[PDB]
Amino acid sequence: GETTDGVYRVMTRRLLGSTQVGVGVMQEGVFHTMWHVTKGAALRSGEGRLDPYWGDVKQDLVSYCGPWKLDAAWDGLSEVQLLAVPPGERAKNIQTLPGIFKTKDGDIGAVALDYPAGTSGSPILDKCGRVIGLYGNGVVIKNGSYVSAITQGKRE
């Protein structure tokens, strides 16, 4: 089916109507998304079937048709763009300066942008348009707003 590079909605028919459960990135023939979106299940692309290849509940990532391809990193300095793909609304680039997740295992970029859960897996881009991670796994702050980790996989 559709294998072109780009950003995709993940939809289901298992609820009322058609519901966007999340988002992902087709690159080099591999679909990348967040584990919590698909829960490891197979996907449809026209007739095309996409079968999972790699996943880790803890990283909260999953790849389909191959291994994780996306190896760019936040430089820790410059602004980035969430290419947000919200349920039933159009792909819109939002530019922001990441803040920081401080963890015992080290420091991660974080993006403080509020969207519905069905935006999980939207890609985060550097100034060269490279995917430096995915949005939609993080924390709910004092306000009630969401802060997301810039969640990137490891390329082999």
Binding site: E2, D5, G6, V7, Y8, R9, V10, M11, T12, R13, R14, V21, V23, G24, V25, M26, Q27, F31, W35, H36, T38, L43, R44, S45, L50, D56, V57, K58, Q59, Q81, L83, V85, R90, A91, K92, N93, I94, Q95, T96, L97, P98, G99, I100, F101, K102, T103, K104, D105, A110, A112, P123, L125, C128, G129, N137, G138, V139, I141, V147, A149
Partner: protein, 39 residues
Amino acid sequence: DMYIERAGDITWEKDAEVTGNSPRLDVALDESGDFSLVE
């Protein structure tokens, strides 16, 4: 049964709506892949 629908190209757009703050947060990642707020 889940399916995918293309939604756009992966490109940096000059003149994108610039917003969101930049918080420094202490967090813990659990085995289930859920982040939580340490203080």
